[PDB]
Write a protein that binds this ligand. Structure first.
Ligand code: A1H2X
Ligand code: A1H2X
Ligand code: CA
Ligand code: CA
Lengths: 255, 255
């Protein structure tokens, strides 16, 4: 009925503690219990930012409208267990004109500035993103190429086809499967895209994106070898300054 | 049909009066009516400078050729309503060898001198600028870095790519969209640059510009927190001493 799941407590720390989490007959582990943030923490932090709350059995982000600014007590949220071959399923609801995202294979990455100080880099320069978006009112829906910044897209690389999202304020179902390099995105019980990590196709997608070797050398390096040496990393959700809700979050380990 | 739009009458005043302005079916408000300067005033002033006139349904600046001097009854012009999330569309036409600009998120800023007197600061140390330029004849087109002073650039920070400006004396279409910190410049119906305010990437752009913390500490402080505490400000156009025409000036409020 339950499985032990290790988790880390702070930036780049080892997974030295474990939670007993429910698992169903098909192997899905419920990683959000509807009541606590146990195992969850802010990306780069040792605590859950206070703009993330629990309401009506959902993880809620309380956004102030600043986009990428991540002002206030915000920042992205991760479940602090590295997964490798997994299938994640969760429900998401976005506010009108809102933007968030579901990250996977994420690494906590710092760089050094010219004086040797640390700089925490964005989660999205190591983590592929399943976009979360109000496709009718957020301008990102019209940017990019072939609708590849609309909901359930692999952000700036592969559009969701079919684009079957429900409108803002409605619950959508997300699926992200990563299995030995094969990745599938699902939206509302349909597979909307499929790709293969660490291939020539993967490099070509990156080189056509905002993360190309020319535009963002660090991002290209991280994403081209997605997941680092061990090809694993965190699932998480995006602070993009907008109200968004997530619930019924469960993960099946596939090997 | 029409919508009430509040405006201020003088330096740093409250927007305690309103105009009834046309709004079309897509939500764009026409803020220049082709006939009057209602709601417009000089930056830092309680009136429209007399070098700004209305000529054949256009706002025209009548330049004497002094560049930054702002001699005579000149100075920059603002529409005195603070916008936060918005899309601006307008047409611009420059004289041969001419220079102007479209400002956004502008603040009316004063500093104090050594004796405690007020000093009105330039609009462009608070306001990002969409450069307006004759790219073939004005020397700005060869200055700066990577063409970041040509038309539709974020002046001294990000070049317009592609550089699709029409020649001098021809009408160009400008788009400025600010949506929860995401900024896009459009020129002649193409998006030519995109950036995100209040991020580490924004700070780095400023720190490489004429507005860096080392070169211009007040400008750095204002622009790094662009739009002030409430992240809003005025749209306006530049007196850079050259004849320039503006028309079809429309703004959609995006939230
Ligand atoms: O939604 C997004 C965009 O609006 C923009 O902020 O870039 C983000 C990171 O690639 C993406 O998550
Ligand atoms: O056009 C311009 C340049 O020629 C120079 O005067 O600086 C101005 C303010 O940054 C800019 O608008
Ligand atoms: Ca997103
Ligand atoms: Ca200018």
């Amino acid at each position: 009925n339950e499985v032990a799941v290790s988790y880390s407590k702070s930036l780049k720390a080892a997974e030295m503690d474990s939670l007993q989490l429910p698992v169903d007959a098909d192997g899905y582990i419920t990683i959000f219990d509807g009541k606590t943030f146990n195992g969850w923490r802010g990306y780069g932090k040792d605590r859950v930012p206070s703009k993330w709350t629990i309401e009506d059995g959902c993880i809620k982000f309380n956004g102030s409208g600043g986009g990428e600014a991540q002002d206030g007590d915000g920042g992205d949220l991760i479940f602090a267990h590295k997964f490798k071959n997994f299938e994640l399923e969760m429900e998401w609801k976005v506010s009108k004109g809102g933007n968030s995202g579901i990250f996977y294979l994420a690494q906590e990455v710092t760089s050094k500035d010219k004086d040797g100080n640390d700089v925490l880099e964005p989660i999205y320069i190591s983590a592929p993103e399943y976009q979360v978006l109000d496709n009718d009112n957020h301008p990102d829906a019209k940017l990019g190429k072939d609708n590849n910044r609309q909901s359930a897209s692999l952000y700036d690389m592969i559009p969701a086809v079919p684009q079957n999202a429900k409108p803002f304020g409605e619950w959508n179902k997300a699926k992200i499967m990563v299995y030995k390099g094969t990745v599938v995105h699902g939206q509302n019980d349909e597979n909307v895209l499929e790709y293969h990590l660490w291939t020539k196709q993967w490099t070509d997608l990156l080189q056509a994106s905002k993360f190309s070797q020319d535009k963002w050398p660090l991002a290209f390096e991280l994403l081209n070898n997605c997941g680092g040496e061990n090809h694993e990393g965190f699932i998480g959700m995006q602070d993009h300054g907008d109200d968004v809700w997530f619930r019924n979050i469960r993960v099946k380990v596939l090997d």
